[PDB]
């Protein structure tokens, strides 16, 4: 369980960085 | 002046008294890889340098200590490993050295000579008969 928790923390940080980079790459305005 | 004592009453030796207390081997997997490499150091330098054939049944000695050469003050331009070559173990130095392709070539020649006629050969003969 401790090993899975550390790997999940690392993978969640990677997902946050990759989703930030994907949004930065690519009735909205009134 | 004179005090009540502390009563302290509750196999092989830990440190050698005659050899200035070399500690007993903490037989880590990295030290075991290093000792296998030391008994196979004839194979590592592939025929360029042969070694004294010391082949006991157990290659791990009872007392070892993994150290590092520091410095000869007379030679310091080429008798000194650089920062990108001072590695942690001995096996890491062997792998960072050259002729790893030479080890792979000799291994694949041995693998062909040992797969020469064993069972894929007989599967091919049986298929050529059945066709």
């Amino acid at each position: 369980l401790g090993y899975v928790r550390t790997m999940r923390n690392i993978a969640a940080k990677e997902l946050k960085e990759l989703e930030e980079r994907y949004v930065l790459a690519g009735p909205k305005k009134i | 002046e004179l005090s009540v004592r502390v009563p302290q009453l509750p196999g092989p030796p830990d440190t050698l008294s005659d050899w200035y207390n070399i500690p007993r081997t903490n037989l880590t997997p990295e030290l075991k890889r290093d000792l296998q490499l030391l008994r196979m150091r004839d194979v590592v330098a592939m025929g360029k340098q042969f070694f004294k054939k010391d082949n006991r049944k157990d290659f791990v000695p009872e007392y070892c200590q993994v150290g590092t050469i520091i410095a000869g003050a007379t030679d310091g331009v080429s008798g000194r490993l650089t920062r990108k070559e001072r590695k942690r173990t001995i096996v890491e130095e062997v792998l960072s050295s050259d002729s790893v392709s030479k080890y792979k070539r000799k291994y694949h020649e041995i693998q062909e000579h040992k797969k020469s006629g064993r069972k894929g050969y007989y599967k091919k003969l049986m298929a050529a008969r059945k066709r």
Binding site: G2, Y3, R5, T6 | -
Partner: protein, 159 residues
Amino acid sequence: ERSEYRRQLAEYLQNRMKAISPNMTELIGALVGARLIAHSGSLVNLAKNPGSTIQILGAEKALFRALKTKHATPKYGIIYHASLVGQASGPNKGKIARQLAAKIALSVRTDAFEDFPENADDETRAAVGIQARAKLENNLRLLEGKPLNKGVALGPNGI
């Protein structure tokens, strides 16, 4: 002269720690408190940590090595060189390290978030530290005064 300056720097660190965090200074003391503040970065950055984090601050290399190779994690970190975990011996050392880290987490949260009327004496500003230290010393002396196992007392015959 360097030694005299280092001694007065230790006295200054003690005075500034009793100024900043009186609860934690009443618990473990100024040097170990300063080590914890140093590793966490700041007081409000230490206060956001759980007690299991504060138990193994500083032992992080062995911690993450053990967590990644499925070994057994270290029992304590910076907390080992406090006073109150150094009196124990055996497994009671790890038990007192757990309990002391939990009380340190409570005391750091109190010293970093509680307000005071500014005419507040230090003896009532370090109240959580005083109470936690007294309770924790009582628990330590119970853990040390746990008796040994009874046995059959045999005579000379074996009867």
